[PDB]
Ligand SMILES: [Ca+2]
């Protein structure tokens with residue numbers, strides 16, 4: 070397979086520290102997308118085929134390092150796009166770099182919304198594509214239907230914002246929140262929060278888990294040892310771990326708990342089966358795929374389609390062309406919306422003994438993403454639309 | 467694409483934790499074993515009786531679970547009939563596997579530093595014995611470290627490696643006239659370290675030596691919580707770790723390990739063509755962020771030593787390969803190694819101080835390769851015993 074020239078893109082993920090358990094597989098999956106596109110002949114611009122090359126930088130689970138590496142990739146390496154980030158902390162540190170330098174970050178991870186950067190595109194779930202339908206499911210259909218919610222997360226803007234939205238949503242459903250605690254990212258001192266869960270949920274109930282990174286390992290092992298188990302009526306709905314982190318922790322610790330995602334490895338379609346089989350072929354029979362990976366995979370194809378539509382790598386024109394791009398993704402059909410996010414089907418999953426999701430609920434159509442939250446009173450009635458100059462980042466409906 | 471021509475193939479077993487608490491440590495061993503295989507295959511494969519065999523593999527997940535290591539071993543021996551399994555990390559996993567490889571007269575190649583007190587006819591070992599790791603580390607921490615002369619506190623995982631390691635360390639410290647002022651174990655995978663931290667501060671009021679035999683990802687909680695607790699090199703507390711190296715250091719974060727210590731036969735900072743080639747090849751195959759380390763160098767060496775033994779034996783039959791492997795020499799990334807009559811390898815010893823980048827600064831190195839003692843010469847029940855499988859009158863455990 071021959072190319073006429075090459076283009077270099079940036080990859081920026083935590084390959085070290087507390088977030089490497091989550092972000093490492095994103096680089097594996099981004100490289101799989103790149104290798105696929107290259108094997109099909111690369112990216113066509115103005116009658117030439119460009120091979121996609123990459124520069125991988127280690128964000129090291131450190132938000133200033135994410136900003137510093139973004140500066141390098143934009144100003145030194147002159148990439149037309151960076152594929153990166155996980156924590157909303159890492160994205161918030163990056164956002165002023167990509168805005169001030171009018172560059173382009175593609176960000177794949179489920180998050181709190183309340184954001185619509187001109188210089189960021191998003192393949193992760195907004196709350197109405199994850200926590201909102203999850204909250205309804207846990208409240209109405211889970212084995213802990215009608216029981217109170219206890220909220221536990223990492224101490225930064227994603228879990229705090231997610232839990233603000235969940236508290237407003239649970240008020241609107243007529244449910245109850247009986248606890249809300251944060252641990253520093255990476256911190257494994259979970260014993261005090263376990264004692265509070267047992268006192269606040271004496272008959273069991275719903276635990277909403279927004280812990281990010283490897284502190285999930287201690288969380289799931291210690292709740293089980295304390296008898297906070299599905300057998301005793303305790304069910305954890307997690308937003309920031311899926312099949313990769315389930316398989317690292319050990320599925321014995323996750324069986325009977327729940328997730329809410331747009332992609333799940335258990336989706337039984339030719340597209341989903343091909344994604345899983347190609348990942349295993351590239352990286353080993355043991356390796357899983359999952360929503361974070363599928364989100365990251367899609368960013369590379371959406372970028373490639375926007376480049377070919379725009380007829381250029383210029384991020385100014387590609388960011389304009391990207392709105393309205395469609396893709397037959399492993400999850401099903403996605404479309405980039407005026408707010409820079411994607412429409413996605415929503416799945417609720419019950420974790421099985423093998424660490425896969427059994428899909429217990431699925432939306433009937435792709436849900437259109439709301440970045441400005443319609444439950445949080447300070448964002449309700451606002452929206453984002455970058456296809457209309459009179460609307461933009463944040464306008465009143 | 468490849469123009470290399472093979473007559474046939476041989477399928478080997480790879481058996482490591484790709485899931486659960488040991489995956490932080492074992493995952494890179496599969497990466498390294500596969501690099502050695504691809505290197506040998508690119509150079510023409512394994513030559514037996516006029517035929518060139520491509521090495522194929524079957525990877526099984528031990529899942530950080532000792533019964534699973536035993537069951538996957540039974541499958542690889544009895545159903546797959548592999549001529550060799552490269553596998554194991556925890557001495558608990560090895561002990562579960564040992565009766566399977568012995569009973570079935572098969573061949574396990576085991577790469578990880580351990581407690582010795584073992585000499586299976588069905589196992590070869592590329593990891594340090596205590597005289598190639600904990601013994602020289604103990605002397606260094608007691609005599610030359612910034613905590614020279616200060617008491618020792620022992621913390622490890624609750625299984626046969628840390629408990630046996632610490633038995634040897636207690637005997638050695640007594641022989642040097644030092645003090646051990648604590649000894650605590652956590653179940654493997656358990657992150658509840660705060661109680662042990664409180665005992666360290668009470669037992670070592672102005673710092674001292676901590677010997678860390680924790681295995682697997684419980685190391686992450688340990689190093690993060692000790693720093694918050696003021697158990698730091700700046701406060702006179704120095705950890706010497708036997709079961710983590712550059713891979714785990716990079717995953718935990720070097721800010722948590724800087725100024726602590728390791729004892730290993732290979733370190734990525736070794737400044738030789740062989741050491742630099744190993745590191746550069748691993749980054750070329752798996753990414754520029756990827757490190758090499760002793761567990762990986764040990765694993766790499768197993769595949770080359772197996773290949774050399776097959777070519778020496780003139781057959782894949784593990785009985786004859788295990789007989790031929792004694793006496794084999796390899797130019798390894800760490801320097802020259804030789805398989806000894808006790809199925810272990812002679813290795814240079816390095817003591818390293820962890821730098822801000824998570825690399826080792828080598829602060830002591832042996833003048834010669836150290837001959838491995840599997841039967842420990844400080845532990846009273848093993849003192850005066852040795853192993854020699856090359857001489858029929860001696861074998862697994864005989865009086866010197
Ligand atoms: Ca060019």
Ligand SMILES: [Ca+2]
Pocket residue numbers: 084085089093716717
């Ligand atoms: Ca890593």
Ligand SMILES: [Ca+2]
Pocket residue numbers: 170171172384385
């Ligand atoms: Ca620009």
Ligand SMILES: [Ca+2]
Pocket residue numbers: 242243244
């Ligand atoms: Ca109610």
Ligand SMILES: [Ca+2]
Pocket residue numbers: 177192193194331332360363364413
């Ligand atoms: Ca997605």
Ligand SMILES: [Ca+2]
Pocket residue numbers: 114115379380381
């Ligand atoms: Ca053009």
Ligand SMILES: [Ca+2]
Pocket residue numbers: 408438439440441451452453
């Ligand atoms: Ca919106």
Ligand SMILES: [Ca+2]
Pocket residue numbers: 316317484485489493
């Ligand atoms: Ca794994």
Ligand SMILES: [Ca+2]
Pocket residue numbers: 570571572783784785
């Ligand atoms: Ca045999």
Ligand SMILES: [Ca+2]
Pocket residue numbers: 577592593594731732760763764813
């Ligand atoms: Ca070794």
Ligand SMILES: [Ca+2]
Pocket residue numbers: 515780
């Ligand atoms: Ca012959």
Ligand SMILES: [Ca+2]
Pocket residue numbers: 808838839840841851852853
């Ligand atoms: Ca011996």
Ligand SMILES: [Cl-]
Pocket residue numbers: 834835
């Ligand atoms: Cl010598």
